[PDB]
Assembly symmetry: C3
Homo-oligomer: 211 residues x 3
């Protein structure tokens, strides 16, 4: 399975589970993640979603090796959702979304933070938006609004790694945690939110995300 899903005290944890590929999103992982979010959106026993990665990476982003195979096959193939479908699930997700960035986040592995209501980042993790060394409309409205024009310029134009202290200093993530405290801290905050009525969490989220 490319995506592990587990419930605990009304927090649904999605753990990206292609650790050998640094949790790069192939089509199957894009599809699984997007579907997991729609399901979470609809499930009355889920208050909060927590997203994290298995192993040393958070997500290396789009799986470019699979993408090469797909464009060179006799017949092109796609997932039901793909990148485009994940962005729409993320953009419309009506419940609190918490990211626990456990290691490298590249491309969508970094820009996904624009849809997070809270982001915790391991002190050993780093982020990169590699667009200029190689983005979506949503990311480039959301990120500048979060970190300001200057921080966003460096993040999105440089293709340089951004470390945990820089990400926090930017306001790109909310808290830095030691590697071993990341999930305990993220989960503790998720459980505070998840104890609240789901209806009122959704109403607050909607009032702050509408513009």
């Amino acid at each position: 399975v490319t995506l592990q899903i587990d419930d605990d005290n009304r927090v649904r944890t999605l753990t990206l589970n292609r650790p050998e590929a640094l949790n790069a999103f192939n089509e199957a992982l894009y599809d699984a993640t997007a579907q997991a979010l729609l399901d979470a959106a609809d499930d009355p026993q889920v208050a909060v979603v927590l997203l994290t990665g298995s192993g040393r990476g958070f997500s290396a982003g789009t799986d470019l090796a699979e993408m090469q195979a797909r464009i060179t096959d006799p017949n092109f193939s796609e997932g039901k959702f793909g990148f485009r479908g994940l962005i729409k699930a993320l953009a419309g997700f009506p419940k609190p979304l918490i990211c626990a960035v456990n290691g490298l986040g590249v491309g969508i592995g970094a820009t996904i933070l624009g849809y997070a209501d809270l982001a915790f980042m391991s002190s050993t993790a780093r982020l990169k938006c590699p667009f200029t060394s190689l983005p979506e409309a949503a990311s480039s409205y959301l990120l500048p609004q979060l970190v300001g024009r200057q921080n966003a310029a460096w993040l999105l134009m440089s293709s340089e790694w951004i470390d945990a202290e820089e990400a926090l200093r930017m306001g790109l993530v909310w808290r830095i945690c030691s590697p071993e405290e990341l999930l305990p801290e993220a989960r503790r905050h998720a459980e505070i939110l998840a104890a609240k009525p789901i209806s009122s969490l959704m109403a607050v989220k909607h009032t702050m995300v509408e513009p």
Copy 2:
């Protein structure tokens, strides 16, 4: 009197004065505060308003005990302004507004900071938005714009206390002061602003608040 009003060097200080009720806004205090702001807006001898609380609280927010009495009385009763009228006075106030948060700020006692041009907070004060354990459209546009999506999510969804260092780290307040330095620092900054021509203070405020 529920609201003390005093002028000194063209700064009008409004001191919420129900210290036994932690300066909870009953209808009479909502009315007095809203009226005090319209008057300040119109008074040519007032450049700046400084808002603070008497005693250990800044404001415990809407007086829920009075609200219970009102909804259980034979006849319902209201103030000329109430909550709704205070928000409109705050939203339209055309002069610099400085808040000196001297202690607990709950509900509107916290979200009122979205209308502040500067906010100073005592190092022993804490803030709470209790909506989810129990908001207005304005607060949830203004606050996210001030503190960013992630800080706003925690503030508005958690119903947890936010201490002085957290409020500053968020950008929810501008400066932290020791308890004894709060009013002297707030007043010193208010007097710098108040020495300027009122016309030009209003023009600058209007140019930065229009969108």
Copy 3:
């Protein structure tokens, strides 16, 4: 010459060069700077512009002494661009713009930072917006968006000096540097950006500046 222009590794450095007048913009310097930006915008060998000042000042802002002479001459005279033309060149500049604030920045010498994609500031530099002791629509949308309502209120209403640590704390500048490290650090970051394809730098900038 009032403006020195030099190319090095696809970074074009504009060095304001009226050091005796603390790099105040007379009409000739407004015209030279605006023109230098249009040219840079069009030049395919320029990826990034770096703007800094010669001598102890970054820019003292509009040259008020020249302005007095102009309004008291028999015949009024103007530059092809002036203040108005510089703002339009700045607002439309489609490539990364980096400011290296080497000393005092007053009026437009401070508000020009609202158009910077990155701003580095010497630890001995200070900024001032003197409007109230004496602004444009763009500055007062851009600056509040960058530093938040409270920081913007102090910056734009107080007419007080803002030092390097305050400017950084506000988010008005991205990094503080020792005086001797300012240009080396600004240039190092400019060269990271400038190594990228110009087309993709412009596309990223446009996606983050459109709203």
